[model samples]
Target: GPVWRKHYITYRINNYTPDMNREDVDYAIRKAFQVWSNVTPLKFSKINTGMADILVVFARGAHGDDHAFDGKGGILAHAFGPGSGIGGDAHFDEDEFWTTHSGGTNLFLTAVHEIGHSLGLGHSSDPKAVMFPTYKYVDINTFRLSADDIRGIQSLYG
Candidate 1:
């Protein structure tokens, strides 16, 4: 079975404004975390202060990182694997819409996948897996991790 071993991840918002409200942003993030939580033992809780293990940000073009965002297409969001300095951090391209519905790549969906990367999980061949390395705009209720994802996360933390 998959288990997160009670790891605490802290994060903050960066310079990215979408049509959605702050509550929407927060809800999307929580929903993203829940995707993994349901599949594994991972539990994420937002904090008010202190540095986060994973620093999430939104940027356009070159955001002072080795991997520059492509703005509109290809690589909507990315994250560094576990380590130090920018590692375990997730970044999203502000040029894209971070929505809950299927207007654009849902932030929650993409964030869940990015978080999988941050947690050291690679891209899964299974399209149903949240770790799948492609943009998919589907209904939130239908979104979920495949069995591969469940097994993958279990392999790492269990």
Candidate 2:
């Protein structure tokens, strides 16, 4: 039930995944934030340095967090709910082949899902929802948030 106390949220890309170029990674992350921002009054800003509400990073196993990511297939990424210190941060598993396209794990889709958690949402049972528990790839060009997603996010930020 946790949610961001403020309407404007800032995020930072602490590092980039080598699987994709810097510009592509930035595009993916920016668009991922847009997915939710488009549905609510909430706003997201990207900061080049310093602390942000969401600290986006890519790391391998045992990255010093309680939820150390399992290599490749098991776990993709995770995020914390809104709060002070570490809350709202999103971490991606570096072991996975992060990509801008569907050939590898799509960074955009993963970010959309994890950022949902960062915004204080849990998994949805609806398969079409971005917050669905499982990952599925769809054509990025035509991807849209499911009604369930809009409803869930609006319940928190509307």
Candidate 3:
């Protein structure tokens, strides 16, 4: 039996108030998208009116979603599978210092991972995987999705 696939995801910047500027955020996101773009047939487009299929936002506890952010450690960020409601949505805790470099958890790194979840990917057993459940701040230039992450995303939308 063939698996189901979601529509082409379009993302919008709900508010651009991260520690990193808008260009950096956009760059990080596009770079992250490139990870999956290289492997799957999925396509992502940027949109206005906040009408994107993926709504990227920063919020605190109980922000209209079941997965209430714990503010700090427990869950840095989370995303929905590919559907309606929160589907393909990615949320980050503004409480955390999102950085372009490795001072704090790299916004690009975490966003990339959370976006993977939004694309229906799960945590990878491989520690080096971008989808690894745990967080480890790594140098930006050297970060690459592990084989496991590639396999996971491929399973869904390849």
Candidate 4:
């Protein structure tokens, strides 16, 4: 029910997941932001400290929020739509073995999907879209947004 009314957005990694390398985690998130930024005029910046427009976090079971992360598999991650406070925050379930590759839950692909929601996007009906409800790992190097994805994002930010 919310959307960032500005073009420039800032995100912060509140915590890191032990499941992946530090560099891989940062790169995965950075690249995910780029996926959306490339299609619109929006720009995303990362900060080490202080509050940011989006707060990326990792947790398992009952975290702070009303929604709790299950043990594993059922839900990999979640994100709030753009707004203040908890809005625009992205959370990953620590129970999953997040990976930079397809070995586990591909960090890059999941980040792409989570960040999309953080940017005020809902799930897409098109299976090829990054905003699709189900998580499907494709070759990250060859990953590209489907027409439906681009059109939806553009309608909001373009």
RMSD, every candidate, angstroms: 2.8, 0.8, 2.2, 0.8
**Counted clashes in each candidate structure:** 0, 0, 0, 0
Which runs in model 2 stand beyond 4 Å of their true positions? none
**What are the Cα lDDT values of the candidates?**
0.77, 0.92, 0.78, 0.92
Summarize candidate 2's per-residue lDDT along 47-87 as a digit string, tens digits: 99888999999999998789988898888999999988899
* Full-model lDDT, candidate 3: 0.78
The digit string of per-residue lDDT tens for model 1 on 53-119 reads 6777888889898988887878899988877667778899887777778887788888888988877
lDDT tens per residue, model 4, 1-158 = 57798898999999999998898899999999999999999999999988899999999999999889998798999999998998999999999999988788998999999998998899998988989999988999989999999898887887
| Colliding pairs, model 1 | none
Which of 1 and 3 is ahead in lDDT?
A: 3
Q: Cα lDDT for residue 90, model 2?
A: 96
Off by over 4 Å in 1: 1-6
